[PDB]
RNA sequence: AGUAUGAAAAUGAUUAUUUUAUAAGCAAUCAUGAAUAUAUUAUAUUAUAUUAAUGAUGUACCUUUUGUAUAAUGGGUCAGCAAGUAAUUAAUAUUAGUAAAACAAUAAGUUAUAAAUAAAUAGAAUAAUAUAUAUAUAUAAAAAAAUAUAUAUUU
RNA sequence: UAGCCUUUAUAAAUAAUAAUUAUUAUAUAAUAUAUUAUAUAAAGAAUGGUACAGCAAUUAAUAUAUAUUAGGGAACUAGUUUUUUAAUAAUAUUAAAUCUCGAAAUAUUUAAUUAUAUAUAAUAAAGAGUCAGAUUAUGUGCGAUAAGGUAAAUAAUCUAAAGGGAAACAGCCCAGAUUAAGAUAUAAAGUUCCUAAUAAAUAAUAAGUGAAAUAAAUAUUAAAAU
RNA sequence: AAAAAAUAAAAUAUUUAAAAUCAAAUAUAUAUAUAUUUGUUAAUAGAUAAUAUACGGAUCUUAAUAAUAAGAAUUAUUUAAUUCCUUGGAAUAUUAUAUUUUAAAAUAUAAAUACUGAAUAUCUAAAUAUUAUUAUUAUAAUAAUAAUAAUAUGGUAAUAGAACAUUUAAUGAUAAUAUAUAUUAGUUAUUAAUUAAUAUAUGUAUUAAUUAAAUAGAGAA
RNA sequence: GAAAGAAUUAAAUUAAUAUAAUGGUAUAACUGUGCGAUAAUUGUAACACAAACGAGUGAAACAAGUACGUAAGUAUGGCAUAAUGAACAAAUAACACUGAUUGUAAAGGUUAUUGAUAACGAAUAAAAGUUACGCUAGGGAUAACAGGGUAAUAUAGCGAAAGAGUAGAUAUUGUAAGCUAUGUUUGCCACCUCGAUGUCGACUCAACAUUUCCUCUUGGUUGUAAAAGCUAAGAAGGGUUUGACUGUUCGUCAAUUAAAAUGUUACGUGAGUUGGGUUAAAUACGAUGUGAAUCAGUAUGGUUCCUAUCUGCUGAAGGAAA
């Protein structure tokens, strides 16, 4: 089981110490979507920065390129060359 | 006071409803942290994600800040708030020791759901 | 204050296009009609260009400042001119040559080749890694601080 | 000179950050009144004296048809004595920058695990700039609980940050411009018009109260409830 | 005096509360045991300076008859139809429209996923940088360009990197079908250069390029 | 049953501690005592704490010796935290380290100690003023004035009503406290420029507010018989002065008037005036200072400019869409 945890507000007015914290999470900029195994550990820290952010639970994690072909949109139109 | 921050002292019905929504979304972050720990306990006793997720008894978080977050006495939900905890924070300066809650600084990320009991 | 040449700018007048006599501000940008201009593939229902219909948004620049549209500062405008450079040193980097030598080559010197210690004549394994040894305090020699030195080929 | 900055490297490398585990107890369970496991609860290793709370000692204040002391008085027959006094006791009731016996959270910080490694320390050889800050939020000293005040503390922004909001708007609310583009989510804030964008429920108001800068003791008229 | 009686319209007050009690709900054992949470006032007056009214402005409180049609644009608590149900539904009511029938009828279906909203994010292409794979062409363990992924790419003082214009020195073809210079119109992710047209000069580039030197770049005194 | 001991709990750190204040203290640091009088010693100090540096604080340990204690042992001054001072320059050692041709020496090193730099990180061995004759660089980074901020102050208002008011708190009166307003003043702040005289008063000219002085309407007024009034409401249309003195705003005073309101407007008003005051250079007077000079002192005297570009206002034309 992953958290899938998205920074969904900003660091901007964010204090020193809840900023650490999402670094430590690993999210970088707002929404800026990252998937975490599941422990205790992962759980306070998601808890210490409550407000910032949305966690979702998952049976799978997806890797970056998974995550990027999902977001892909269709592309209305199938090439023929000639 | 020639500077003008032209603040009002109460908050419109979309502000409110904006925060209703902002308050929501915390306790559901909160669950969602609860519930992905018990799938994880689970999952270690032997059970399949669906299997856990069906589970009768669900299992309470041990650490100490999820457990107390948990309770509804220390952090209640949007639904078991009052409405004056929502748009009120305590001020003991201001009069009523009363303040909105759009006046506290950072207040869209700030959390701040109990007020003392009589104030 | 040479001699040419000189569609360099600021600036004057005139004309042509185009806009402008119910509309209010860094005067632009963007949007958008319209008019005009030119165009040797405008095939055109074309292109570009010029232009304050028209609507949106838009508080010069600079310095100095906690902070400037600022009623803080400087400039009428254009053209020319105007400001981290040189000599003698020392240190660090990087590269190249050379290399336990280098530089220079007659010599002489400088730097490194030993660490030191205020300084003197002291100086780095008597069986190997600090538990060895070297110097300084101390001292019969030790231990104890510090720094330094030894693990085919010297750095 | 440090603090904060940059460049170029270094490794016995994770030391950096963050979070968790740590504890108390309860149930059951298995062993041997025992002690493991599980689960549940508890603001849950260690340090502290703020809020909070309290009146202990200390510093203060109140009240006694109390007592006792002596008395102020008082018949009487100096005593007894009676309506005052003071302290002190008794009981009860309170507060405090420099009291804290109760006592937070934040916090300080411990080891290991864990997640950050296109990441953090730490260290080598060098370059700086700054040392007039401001506001806003919170707890304060000062000030009249005055100030766009002043003195620090803490957080954020500004400073040095363009964008959206707050009519306009250095510092507030959002949010960080590499160059586009403009379909999809949105944030803060809004959706009669100006001005992008809405429709509902249910109350209550009648004063344009009000509608983005809430003016008071008090009077009146209402309304509930007891 | 005066009562279909209280169930509710008397006075005199206190009161302005969910602590308490009560109701509603959560949480535990659960045939309802405890604990937590939620639920208690309104209007007017007071009202108050000096260029000009100033909620930003318009303006906003709704009324049967009667338009497809209005009915806060204020305050309090809420929804995204509504009620149920466990975000997702079930039901149904509207709303729409269709159908085919006697404007209604009944059936059908949409559809009930509010919207605006940033230089945020994603998406869609472009650049540079870095890590990781590639592809191609030719310290190849290299380079040039191109791919896929990710991360970053505001900025004063300041640090570092890399470029361009100008002038001189070294090397140095070319040629008025050229060059130099100017205007205009183009092209090159464009301080620059280059194409073309045109004007003027000049029978010509210290010319391209590599270095090395700069009196090397001005809206700021 | 009794004695005696050993003590144990409670209480206490209020006593006391060299001295402030805090922290600690009875397991005692405090107190008595014996001995002693030594460790109020001598070399290396790791390592931390603190920390810019210079410094400072704790201190394991190694080594030499001393003291007390059966012993374990303890002792590198005091329960702790203040109790101090760089270098340079001399000095007195000590040292045996240099010894300028040599030998000595001189002198200098090394160690030991010394006296102050209290503006207490000490600029030298050694240095106060005044300037209205003043000057330059600047700042408006910190005062002048004017704006702003603020509202103690000042101005006005309200609730309450002690007390006046013959008799009655609310005819009229209204303390102390209470709540506001105001944004005029005296402040306070330094946020404006500190190239804003409009230098504070007059004149010219007014504009505006209304918190009404008169004038108009009207309530109350044992405190309205009448008339005078008092007080309050509406009300800003109109009107609200001339002299003596004073630089004066102000005030007193005279004479008036229906009344002679209160303000705002850069304490309205000079690129429109005046310049008397405050105001530079002369100057004298009292007081101050050794003196130059000074002063909230008093006094005589004493230089102000600008042809209007824009806005605005007053008039006047032309153009024009009629």
Request: net charge positive; hydrophobic share 30%; glycine share 4%.
């Given at each position: 089981?992953?958290?899938?945890?998205?920074?969904?507000?900003?660091?901007i007015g964010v204090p020193?110490?809840?900023?650490?914290?999402?670094?430590?999470?690993?999210?970088?900029?707002?929404?800026?979507?990252?998937?975490?195994?599941?422990?205790?550990?992962?759980?306070?820290?998601?808890?210490?920065?409550?407000?910032?952010?949305?966690?979702?639970?998952?049976?799978?994690?997806?890797?970056?390129?998974?995550?990027?072909?999902?977001?892909?949109?269709?592309?209305?139109?199938?090439?023929?060359?000639? | 006071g020639g500077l003008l921050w032209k603040i009002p002292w109460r908050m419109s019905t979309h502000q409110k409803?904006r925060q209703?929504?902002?308050?929501?979304?915390?306790?559901?972050?909160?669950?969602?942290?609860?519930?992905?720990?018990?799938?994880?306990?689970?999952?270690?006793?032997?059970?399949?994600?669906?299997?856990?997720?069906?589970?009768?008894?669900?299992?309470?978080?041990?650490?100490?800040?999820?457990?107390?977050?948990?309770?509804?006495?220390?952090?209640?939900?949007?639904?078991?708030?009052?409405?004056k905890?929502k748009y009120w924070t305590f001020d003991k300066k201001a009069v009523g020791y009363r303040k909105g809650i759009h006046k506290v600084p950072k207040w869209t990320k700030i959390?701040i759901?109990?007020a003392?009991?009589?104030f």
């Open positions: 089981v992953f958290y899938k945890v998205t920074l969904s507000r900003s660091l020193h110490t809840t900023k650490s914290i999402v670094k430590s999470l690993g999210l970088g900029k707002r929404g800026s979507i990252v998937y975490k195994k599941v422990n205790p550990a992962i759980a306070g820290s998601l808890a210490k920065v409550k407000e910032l952010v949305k966690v979702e639970v998952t049976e799978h994690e997806l890797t970056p390129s998974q995550q990027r072909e999902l977001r892909k949109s269709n592309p209305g139109f199938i090439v023929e060359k000639r | 409803t209703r929504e902002r308050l929501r979304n915390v306790d559901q972050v909160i669950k969602q942290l609860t519930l992905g720990l018990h799938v994880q306990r689970c999952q270690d006793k032997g059970l399949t994600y669906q299997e856990a997720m069906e589970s009768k008894k669900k299992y309470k978080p041990r650490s100490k800040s999820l457990r107390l977050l948990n309770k509804p006495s220390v952090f209640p939900k949007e639904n078991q708030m009052s409405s905890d959390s759901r109990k003392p009991k009589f």
